[PDB]
């Protein structure tokens, strides 16, 4: 997803979601030690 041909028209916005992304899991800054 997100790599098929350049979609213009009404589908242009929808084309961008489910794009390959990152899932970050880190500790909060306020709970280090």
């Amino acid at each position: 997803n997100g790599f098929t041909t350049g979609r213009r028209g009404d589908l242009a916005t929808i084309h961008g979601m489910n794009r390959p992304f990152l899932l970050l899991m880190a500790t909060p800054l306020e709970r280090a030690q």
């Binding site: 041909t5 979609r7 028209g9």
Partner: protein
Amino acid sequence: FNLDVDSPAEYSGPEGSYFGFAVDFFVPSASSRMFLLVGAPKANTTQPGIVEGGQVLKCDWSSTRRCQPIEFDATGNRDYAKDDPLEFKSHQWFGASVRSKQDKILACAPLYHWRTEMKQEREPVGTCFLQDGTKTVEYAPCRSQDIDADGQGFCQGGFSIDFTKADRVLLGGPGSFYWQGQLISDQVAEIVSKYDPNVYSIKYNNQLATRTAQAIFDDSYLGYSVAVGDFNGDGIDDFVSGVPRAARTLGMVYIYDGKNMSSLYNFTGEQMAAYFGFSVAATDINGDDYADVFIGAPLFMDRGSDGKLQEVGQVSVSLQRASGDFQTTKLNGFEVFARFGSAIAPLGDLDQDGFNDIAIAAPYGGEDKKGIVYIFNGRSTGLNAVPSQILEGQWAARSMPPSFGYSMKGATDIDKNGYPDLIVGAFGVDRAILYRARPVITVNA
């Protein structure tokens, strides 16, 4: 003023088949007989497994009104694999555009969906069948290897067609490149000689076409209507097409050089949402040997006396001059909501004076909205802005409005009385009508 409304030659097709959506004349000089040509985009056919294909019924004038459908095609859907149809001919609106040279017939289908080769899809590319005497061919330059909504997948090729005087076919696809539009020109001398009944994407050596533009031009609808005529003195006809949603729905009209498809002149509308370029017809209305442009804007809203707006329509007349300029004049409709300027067709010389003539139709005008056609006469100055004759439809609306005046044709004498004639199609009641131009005598008291 000489067209005879006392004895109109009648015609009729099947009920509910849109008989008369497109009309023309057939004059094969070899056989020296005269035939009409009427399209029925909603007609049923003999094709197996196809419902509502479309028919182009060839109707005769010489006292026999027998309309025999031209067998442009008889088969059904060709297939890619087992139970994998390649094309979908059902509801294809075949015959919505009929154009005839002396010995050729070109009827196109704009709503012909097909299963693209790469993946199972339904792309309305459209196709055309060019019958040249005995040989019959298929013409479909918008179904290619590079198609999608991005490409010319939605081309709807064959929405508008015309013949150049130099044996070329000008084809207009409104929907390609996300509805920017496209024009395609190609010569018949190559359409016939390049047709393998087992090949779909055919490359034509001497084809001319217009390419992709920036994304701000979407929904322009270039090719919504085409016409031809010489406009830069070379002698070769030049491609005039109407793009009725350009410039924030103002409407524009483009003129392309007929030798290399290079832009020459532009027009532009003056009101938003007026459909400037809906109809285009290039004739020679003042008799100065220079072709003159006509442009239709059926939805133009015009200020009333009190200030209230009225949607009456407008036709723009633009007289070509020898230096590259255009002397433009406006011309407004007569009844509100009548869509004056829907159809424009040159008439030749309807009264044989020396200046060609023209006729403009208001399909939804008239009493009880049956339809009205107006007849204009040229002069040495230009068009004469008061219509000499008013042609009115005689048919009531059965389910939908009769739409008398949606399509019309002229400039060919079928009686051979010396004067050109006119056929009109009131497709909302599945009828076509032929009118005859009476000879004109000059009494010098």
